[PDB]
Design an enzyme around this catalytic site. Structure first.
Site, short mmCIF file in Angstrom:
data_model
loop_
_atom_site.label_atom_id
_atom_site.label_comp_id
_atom_site.label_asym_id
_atom_site.label_seq_id
_atom_site.Cartn_x
_atom_site.Cartn_y
_atom_site.Cartn_z
N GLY B 10 -3.69 3.66 6.65
CA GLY B 10 -4.05 2.27 6.57
C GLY B 10 -2.88 1.36 6.85
O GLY B 10 -1.72 1.80 6.92
N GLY B 13 -0.17 -2.62 2.81
CA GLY B 13 -0.94 -3.47 1.88
C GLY B 13 -2.42 -3.13 1.80
O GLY B 13 -3.22 -3.96 1.37
N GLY B 15 -3.69 -0.61 0.05
CA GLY B 15 -3.98 0.02 -1.24
C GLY B 15 -3.73 1.51 -1.32
O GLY B 15 -4.19 2.14 -2.26
N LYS B 16 -3.01 2.08 -0.36
CA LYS B 16 -2.76 3.51 -0.31
C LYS B 16 -2.09 4.10 -1.57
O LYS B 16 -2.50 5.13 -2.06
CB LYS B 16 -1.96 3.87 0.95
CG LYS B 16 -2.70 3.62 2.28
CD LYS B 16 -1.99 4.27 3.47
CE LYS B 16 -0.54 3.85 3.60
NZ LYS B 16 -0.36 2.42 3.49
N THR B 17 -1.05 3.46 -2.06
CA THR B 17 -0.36 3.92 -3.28
C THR B 17 -1.30 3.93 -4.50
O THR B 17 -1.35 4.90 -5.25
CB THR B 17 0.89 3.06 -3.53
OG1 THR B 17 1.78 3.23 -2.42
CG2 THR B 17 1.62 3.46 -4.85
N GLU B 35 4.20 8.94 0.83
CA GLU B 35 4.98 8.64 2.03
C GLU B 35 6.45 8.73 1.61
O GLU B 35 6.81 8.28 0.52
CB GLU B 35 4.62 7.26 2.56
CG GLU B 35 4.91 7.02 4.04
CD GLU B 35 4.61 5.59 4.50
OE1 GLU B 35 4.64 4.65 3.66
OE2 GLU B 35 4.35 5.42 5.71
N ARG B 88 -0.07 8.80 4.85
CA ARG B 88 0.28 8.70 6.28
C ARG B 88 0.65 10.04 6.91
O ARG B 88 0.52 11.09 6.27
CB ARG B 88 1.37 7.64 6.50
CG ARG B 88 0.88 6.21 6.23
CD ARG B 88 1.41 5.25 7.27
NE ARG B 88 0.87 3.91 7.07
CZ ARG B 88 1.51 2.93 6.41
NH1 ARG B 88 2.70 3.15 5.90
NH2 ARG B 88 0.94 1.74 6.27
N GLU B 155 9.70 -4.72 3.15
CA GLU B 155 8.57 -5.21 3.96
C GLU B 155 8.00 -6.58 3.56
O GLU B 155 7.03 -7.06 4.18
CB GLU B 155 7.42 -4.21 3.91
CG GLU B 155 6.64 -4.33 2.62
CD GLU B 155 5.91 -3.08 2.26
OE1 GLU B 155 5.05 -3.17 1.36
OE2 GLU B 155 6.18 -2.03 2.87
N1 GEO Z 1 5.80 5.18 11.05
C1 GEO Z 1 6.02 4.28 10.07
C2 GEO Z 1 5.51 4.45 8.78
C3 GEO Z 1 5.78 3.47 7.84
N2 GEO Z 1 6.50 2.39 8.17
C4 GEO Z 1 6.83 1.36 7.17
O1 GEO Z 1 7.17 1.96 5.90
C5 GEO Z 1 6.93 1.01 4.85
C6 GEO Z 1 6.35 1.73 3.64
O2 GEO Z 1 5.00 2.11 3.95
C7 GEO Z 1 5.95 -0.02 5.41
O3 GEO Z 1 6.57 -1.30 5.43
C8 GEO Z 1 5.69 0.41 6.84
F1 GEO Z 1 4.55 1.06 6.88
F2 GEO Z 1 5.72 -0.62 7.68
C9 GEO Z 1 6.98 2.26 9.41
O4 GEO Z 1 7.71 1.17 9.75
N3 GEO Z 1 6.75 3.18 10.36
#
Ligand code: GEO
Ligand code: GEO
Lengths: 182, 189
Positions: B10, B13, B15-17, B35, B88, B155
């Site tokens: 997703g 923001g 709601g994954k956590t 993650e 993720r 972020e």
């Molecule tokens: N491949 C990815 C995966 C995650 N993110 C970033 O990591 C932060 C925590 O989810 C989020 O701020 C984010 F998702 F943006 C990223 O920049 N690139």
């Protein structure tokens, strides 16, 4: 298979030395440095970009070098002897170390490349049976480079630095069977 | 050597956590993989996540290189449990996050091309276990509010525009598909 790595400075004679083995290509896996891949990453010459703007391009170039080397090291072969020009080890111990030292790789960039090297060495045993070190003086190396590309504007100090790193690694055992040719 | 594996996907923001925490009572049967944010925040003392948010043109490539590596480590992590649930994946990294940095100019062509060569070699070298994707589908504005309503972190200043683009990329992959089984949850609740 039995694995031999040809190591040495830029202009140490490796391409000329390796041309000798171009006729044993049915007894020997002959893996020449993938400079052509580096010159053409789907139209992008990473080698040229790195030499032109090291602070920008040293990181992705060395990451791609790490990948191509990893490909060469793990490629399958029936032949009972493998000869490779350079390795993931010289990439790490000489080239990446020097770019860290000269400021081309900021700490986080150096750290990312190190995590990949650590992960690769934990996931697989990379076969290195024999190292052949084409040892040269930076002056001799500089002159081969001039008597023959993207690299032609390498300063001598850069060759001096890569020289001591090879010496540290391959003579003084500062990094992890070595045969020293002249 | 991998169990049935569920990937939770997703926007930032979405709601994954919160969602993943519901599975903590089931850790006897579930390998739960958050993650790897803690890794990205401390790469031998360097916070690659903060550096990326501060200056993406400089840090997007090394950051996304390390993301790839850490996701690879999660995908391949050894477990005896019957189920693995991951926050993720190497797929969202490639199809969403790297794709958006390429589009917005943070990754130049050669940088993007290097990351793609890594992804190609990874998918030739191993089969990444991916049996189900749970997509937490949210609107960008709700995602935006969620971020702004919680503790300050790296972020916290992500623009709505950035969120909007990430949203379309998740929609491209998980709805239109468009990219190489998805359960869609309404996560605007
Ligand atoms: N491949 C990815 C995966 C995650 N993110 C970033 O990591 C932060 C925590 O989810 C989020 O701020 C984010 F998702 F943006 C990223 O920049 N690139
Ligand atoms: N790990 C490596 C390996 C090679 N190179 C450079 O590639 C060119 C051809 O050997 C040479 O110009 C070179 F040696 F400098 C590099 O910059 N880093």
């Amino acid at each position: 298979p039995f694995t031999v790595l040809i190591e040495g400075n830029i202009g140490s004679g490796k391409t000329t030395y390796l041309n000798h083995f171009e006729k044993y290509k049915n007894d020997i896996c002959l893996l020449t440095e993938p400079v052509e891949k580096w010159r053409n990453v789907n139209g992008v010459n990473l080698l040229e970009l790195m030499y032109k703007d090291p602070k920008k391009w040293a990181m992705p170039f060395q990451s791609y070098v790490t990948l191509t080397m990893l490909q060469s090291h793990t490629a399958p072969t029936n032949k009972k002897l493998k000869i490779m020009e350079r390795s993931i080890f010289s990439a790490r111990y000489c080239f990446v170390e020097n770019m860290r030292r000269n400021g081309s790789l900021e700490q986080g960039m150096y750290n990312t490349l190190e995590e990949w090297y650590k992960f690769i060495e934990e996931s697989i045993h990379v076969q290195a049976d024999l190292i052949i070190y084409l040892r040269t003086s930076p002056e001799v190396a500089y002159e081969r480079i001039r008597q023959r590309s993207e690299e032609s504007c390498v300063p001598l100090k850069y060759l001096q630095e890569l020289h001591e790193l090879h010496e540290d690694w391959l003579i003084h055992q500062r990094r992890p069977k070595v045969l020293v040719l002249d």
